[PDB]
């Protein structure tokens, strides 16, 4: 399925000026050192997470810092993401900063939760340390990008504990004896993120690594033809068709989802099923051993039966936000909870706070306001609970409803517990900044269409790459040309 496949994180690393000074002002020293850190983090991910960390690119600042590195990891993370947005042109799944300085916090790095594949979000910042230590810091930063957030709820309950207490676990705090391992709860969090539609960019295998080709690493570099993984592993798949990184007599391929053994899979065979209704199935090209790069529906397609909208391949609803913050057993409150409590302008619901006062929502915006779930805990899975839990009770005509919420802080700015931007407040309407807006207010990009009032001329689906995926018998970039192949 999606979680049985090998996932590949394309990674860029930026070394700041102090990291350059730690190394004696040697570019080769800095770059090879960071290659060592990435190598160890790759050894961590390779087994437990069935995921590989590949370094596509690196740059080091020899002269000075492009922006001032901050002792607060979150501030440095934010400005670093500004840098990579306005400056770095290189294609990567994640861009991480290696800082020679030291953060004034317990966290040795900061990374956005579920950030991968995102231009603004994907990335992290990591303070200087020992190779083995900084490999752990990078491992937990890329874990935060990858969707593994410690269950603050199962931890406080004692549900998720580290099987080995001697070193604890990666998602456990740094100490002299470096954590080598992820909890089973972490792996479950990662599987749940992949099945949720996140991480579509992790499914493509790189070709040219930053280091000269070596036959037998499992990657096809320049000058090779086929590669299986290892001599012992090769026997499982690819040992038949692959000899000394050169194809045998009959093979089109060595290893892959589209390679049956030595031969290609016919065009139109499905290597990957869609994980949700935001996802587009992928078919084997028959020109390639790899499953075609993972793509999903473009942002703005409706999911969950006009209960939510797709962003980055993941469905945004208020119920999934309630389950995200408070755990799976929690469900979102009835719409009447919003339609009543939010217009009051109290701590039990509101549009937000201005000076030490709650704003009462307008009747139009009432679904964009304070997030209300049904039976709530006091310990959110992520972030910091600020204050107490809100519970009111509203009667409708014989049905007594419980409206509960809480203020969960991640960034001093970003606050969970208010309806996430992009959640539908109604037909063709989404929430932005606690207000209910029509779709055109998001200015969505569109694919090609040859027909008035249709997407992909009505014959196809708009992907997140802004290319039309045609239905059967339809061809062309707009899918307007009918070309049956039988």
């Amino acid at each position: 399925n999606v979680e049985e496949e090998t996932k590949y994180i394309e990674l860029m690393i930026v070394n700041d000026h102090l990291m350059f000074k730690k190394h004696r002002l040697s570019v080769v020293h800095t770059n090879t050192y960071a290659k060592s850190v990435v190598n160890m983090a790759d050894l961590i991910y390779k087994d437990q997470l069935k995921t590989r960390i590949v370094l596509v690119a690196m740059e080091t600042w020899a002269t000075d810092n492009k922006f001032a590195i901050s002792e607060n990891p979150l501030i440095t993370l934010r400005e670093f993401m500004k840098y990579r947005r306005d400056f770095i042109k290189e294609k990567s799944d994640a861009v991480h900063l290696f800082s020679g300085s030291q953060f004034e916090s317990s966290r040795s790095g900061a990374a956005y939760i579920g950030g991968i594949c995102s231009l603004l979000k994907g990335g992290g910042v990591n303070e200087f340390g020992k190779t083995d230590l900084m490999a752990v810091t990078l491992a937990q930063s890329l874990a935060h990008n990858i969707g593994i957030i410690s269950d603050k709820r199962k931890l406080a309950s004692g549900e998720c504990k580290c099987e080995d207490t001697w070193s604890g676990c990666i998602m456990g705090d740094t100490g002299y004896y470096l954590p080598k391992k992820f909890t089973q709860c972490n792996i479950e969090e990662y599987h749940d993120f992949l099945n949720s539609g996140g991480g579509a960019c992790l499914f493509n295998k790189p070709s040219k690594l930053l280091d000269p080709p070596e036959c037998g690493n499992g990657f096809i570099e320049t000058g090779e033809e086929c590669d299986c993984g290892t001599p012992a592993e090769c026997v499982l798949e690819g040992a038949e068709c692959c000899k000394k990184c050169t194809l045998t007599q009959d093979s089109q391929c060595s290893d892959g989802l589209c390679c049956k053994k030595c031969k290609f899979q016919p065009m139109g065979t499905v290597c990957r099923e869609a994980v949700n209704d935001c996802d587009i199935r992928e078919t084997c090209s028959g020109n390639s051993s790899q499953c075609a790069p993972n793509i999903h529906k473009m942002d703005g397609y409706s999911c969950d039966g006009v209960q939510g909208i797709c962003f980055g391949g993941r469905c945004k609803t208020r119920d999934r936000q309630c389950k995200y913050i408070w755990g799976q057993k929690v469900t979102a409150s009835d719409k009447y909870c919003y339609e009543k409590l939010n217009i009051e302008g109290t701590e039990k619901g509101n549009c937000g706070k201005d000076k030490d006062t709650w704003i009462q929502c307008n009747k139009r915006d009432v679904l964009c306001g304070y997030l209300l779930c049904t039976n709530i805990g006091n310990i959110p899975r992520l972030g910091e609970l600020d204050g107490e839990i809100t519970s009111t009770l509203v009667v409708q005509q014989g049905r007594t409803l419980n409206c509960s919420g809480g203020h969960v802080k991640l960034e001093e700015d970003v606050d969970l517990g208010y309806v996430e931007d992009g959640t539908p407040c109604g037909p063709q309407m989404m929430c932005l900044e606690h207000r209910c807006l029509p779709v055109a207010s998001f200015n969505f990009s569109t694919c090609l269409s040859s027909k008035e009032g249709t997407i992909c001329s009505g014959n196809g689906v708009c992907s997140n790459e802004l290319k039309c995926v045609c239905n059967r018998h339809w061809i062309g970039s707009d899918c307007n040309t009918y070309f049956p192949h039988n």
């Binding site: 340390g129 001697w166 604890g168």
Partner: protein, 515 residues
């Protein structure tokens, strides 16, 4: 009445090829000779039944050993002649019990050595012949020269057969210095099957016990002295999980043990004396201390403190004062750093002539820092770091005369000893070492040693040379992966405890070696 093997004169008797020493020898025979005898040894009291002999002769015999007190029961013997025999061993007390012995000859037996005090206790002796033997001159014979000097008896000159340097030299002419034979050493005594992170000692009710932290079982192990066979045995345990450091503290005949764990740990225990079991007293705040690498005990100005180094970025190294009902937080240190080790030392800081309490703690990927306590603020200030030093794990200190030195352990590269100058530590000695997790100074009977542990290599034990003012290579211990070394003193007995992370713990005796 004459024994069958022997043929007897009127006053004398002669025994040839006798298979045993006859007990039936008739009285008024004052002389007995054994020649080419069958028996291969002379046991104790063999002659008890023949008290009347004034003379005894042994010639042309092969003897495994002549036992202690073989001649006991011969008060009247003036003359004892052992000559031209093969004798493998001669006991120190063999001649004990003859006061009346006048002439004694060991001559021509080709004896390689003699035991000390073999001539002790014979007053009457006017003559000894040691000639005709091949003597290897060594410690064993070191006494002989001294005896030759102070003896009343007449002894003709005898010569060393060996060693090659001293061969054909008069034993009387020799001086003690030429006998060499000086050593000191550590020898393995006990082997503990359990692997141990750290070891410590304490004195409770004038009894010195030993605490050993075994990480992988989580149990804090206690060893007490047993006189029955071996001085070290395990009386008691404290149960825990992922125990790292176990530090006993005795305050006014009340035992307190601070034990740090990597799981839900950092608990303070006290010994309830009536039940003589340990009871949990306090729990260190889990937010302040998270992954302690270390615990350090010190007492300043009639106050007790202990400080815990936190190698987590999250935890802060914290010092806990004793209010007398227990321990409570005093000062957090080195916030946001990973602290491998904390070390307390009292060092003279110029201009001050008095010694002042100082802390030294070692942060990973960082220079060690020194902290000077200020009495007015009751706290350390003016943070200063050891200059030109990279990547240390621990710092330990020792004093020779008035000056103080520190042993800086660097897991990679050179580990080195520095001397404290007026304002600063100056480089003294640099020893590179491979995977060294400990550098331990020790002082045993005014003997300063420095043990440098190694995982991949041998553990190198060094001795302090007063003339050279540096450590000198001394001995090499084999211990699998030592994290620690600890000096234990029983009464008049000294032991060395070597913990092993990947292997069994080692217990060595402290041995002084002479003759």
């Amino acid at each position: 009445k004459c024994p069958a093997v022997c043929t007897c004169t009127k006053d004398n008797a002669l025994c040839e090829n006798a298979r045993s020493i006859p007990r039936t020898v008739p009285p008024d025979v004052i002389s007995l000779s054994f020649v080419r005898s069958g028996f291969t040894e002379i046991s104790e009291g063999s002659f008890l039944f023949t008290p009347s002999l004034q003379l005894l002769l042994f010639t042309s015999n092969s003897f495994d050993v002549i036992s202690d007190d073989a001649f006991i029961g011969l008060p009247h013997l003036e003359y004892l002649f052992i000559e031209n025999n093969n004798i493998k061993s001669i006991s120190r007390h063999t001649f004990r019990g003859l006061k009346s012995l006048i002439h004694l000859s060991l001559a021509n037996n080709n004896l390689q050595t003699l035991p000390k005090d073999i001539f002790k206790g014979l007053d009457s002796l006017t003559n000894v012949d040691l000639r005709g033997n091949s003597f290897n001159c060594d410690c064993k014979l070191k006494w002989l020269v001294e005896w030759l000097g102070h003896t009343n008896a007449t002894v003709e000159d005898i010569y060393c057969e060996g060693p090659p340097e001293y061969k054909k030299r008069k034993i009387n002419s020799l001086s003690s210095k030429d006998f060499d034979c000086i050593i000191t050493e550590f020898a393995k005594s006990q082997d503990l099957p359990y692997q141990s992170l750290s070891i410590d000692t304490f004195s409770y009710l004038n009894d010195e016990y030993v605490v050993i932290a075994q990480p992988f079982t989580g149990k804090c192990i206690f060893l007490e002295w047993d006189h029955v066979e071996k001085t070290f045995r395990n009386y008691d345990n404290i149960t825990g999980t992922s125990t790292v450091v176990c530090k006993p503290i005795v305050i006014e005949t009340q035992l307190y043990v601070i034990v740090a764990q990597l799981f839900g740990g950092s608990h303070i225990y006290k010994r309830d004396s009536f039940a003589n079991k340990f009871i949990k007293i306090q729990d260190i705040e889990i937010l302040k201390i998270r992954k302690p690498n270390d615990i350090e005990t010190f007492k300043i100005e009639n106050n007790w403190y202990f400080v815990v180094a936190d190698s987590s970025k999250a935890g802060f190294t914290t010092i806990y004062k004793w209010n007398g009902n227990g321990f409570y937080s005093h000062q957090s240190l080195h916030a946001w750093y990973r602290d491998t080790d904390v070390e307390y030392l009292e060092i003279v800081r110029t201009p001050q002539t008095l010694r002042t309490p100082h802390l030294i703690l070692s942060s990973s990927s960082q220079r060690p820092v020194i902290y000077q306590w200020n009495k007015a603020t009751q706290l350390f200030t003016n943070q200063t770091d050891i200059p030109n030093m990279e990547d240390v794990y621990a710092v330990k200190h020792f004093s020779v005369k008035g000056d103080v030195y520190i042993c800086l352990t660097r897991f990679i590269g050179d580990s080195k000893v520095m001397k404290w100058g007026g304002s600063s530590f100056q480089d003294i000695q640099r020893m590179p070492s491979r995977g060294s997790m400990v550098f331990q100074p020790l002082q045993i009977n005014n003997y300063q040693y420095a043990i440098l542990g190694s995982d991949y290599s041998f553990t190198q034990v060094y001795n302090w040379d007063a003339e050279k003012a540096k450590f000198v290579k001394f001995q090499e211990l084999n211990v699998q992966a030592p994290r620690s070394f600890t000096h234990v003193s029983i009464n008049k007995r000294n032991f060395l405890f070597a913990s092993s992370f990947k292997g069994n713990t080692q217990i060595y005796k402290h041995v002084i070696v002479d003759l």
